[PDB]
Amino acid sequence: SETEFEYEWDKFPVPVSAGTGMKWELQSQSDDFNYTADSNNKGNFEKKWTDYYHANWSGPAPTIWQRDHISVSDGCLRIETSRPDDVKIVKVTSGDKEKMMPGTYTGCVTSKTRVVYPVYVEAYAKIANSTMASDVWMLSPDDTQEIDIIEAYGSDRVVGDDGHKFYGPDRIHLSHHVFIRDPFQDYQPTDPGSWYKDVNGTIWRNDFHRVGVYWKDPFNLEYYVDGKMVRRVSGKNIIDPNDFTKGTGLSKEMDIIINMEDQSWRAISGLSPTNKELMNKDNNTFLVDWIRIYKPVED
Ligand code: NA
């Protein structure tokens, strides 16, 4: 189909075929974010999004999500990070190291509607130049199934205090999780391809990039970075080898989530952002220019 451009994003085609006799149909949850909003005047934001996580949880410690850290301006969804002088102290845990730290305020967004396979979800985003995680992801309301489109750390600071090296700003984590809630277990793929690096050593922080996933069926994901298929996750052995879904696969409809996180396992090793690093607000702002969603339908 050779038709006139209607949206910002039409300069970029959907990087995969919709299937034999099918075409892609844009879903109304898609947003180009070309309007103005903040927590006091949500207006157009409120038609598709809420400015919190899908449940009343403030996030992985020492993250503390705040509604007023979300806004839309200058053609982007903007998520900021700050830390007041008076911020509360939170107990942070990972493994069984244990540490009291100051909280880190940031933001989280959740879609008003859900998606389910078959579906292509693509964000055009500029990863924050921050030790904070910049995240675009999907999670079922019962917290048992998750598809991660973007999980990335954009800062050059990658050394703990110690004993670890951490994945750096040349990587995007392309993953998914399956969970049992109680007693708690987490599966994700664990192979080198899950931490995506391109051949040129692209530092993703430096510009806007398209990252999307084709959630094709419950045993097939395909990840696309700037229109190129860079990782295929196919079959029971890599989707759910421990049988946490009892054979269903990735089958439950999901909320779309966009946020930043000061993640516990990183924060406990010294990668929480310093008060000095947070003086520069552009560095600790995650930007999403747009997010688009297509499903296959009959031609
Ligand atoms: Na935009």
Author numbering: 43 to 341
Please share excerpts from the published article on this structure.
determined the three-dimensional structures of these four agarases. initiated by GH86 or GH16B, which generates NAOS. depolymerized by GH86, and systematically saccharified by the exo-acting GH117B and GH2C enzymes. exo-acting β-d-galactosidases, while GH117A and GH117B are α-1,3-L-neoagarooligosaccharide hydrolases.
GH16B, indicated as plus (+) and minus (−) subsites. (gray) of the GH16B catalytic groove. GH16B to release smaller NAOS fragments.
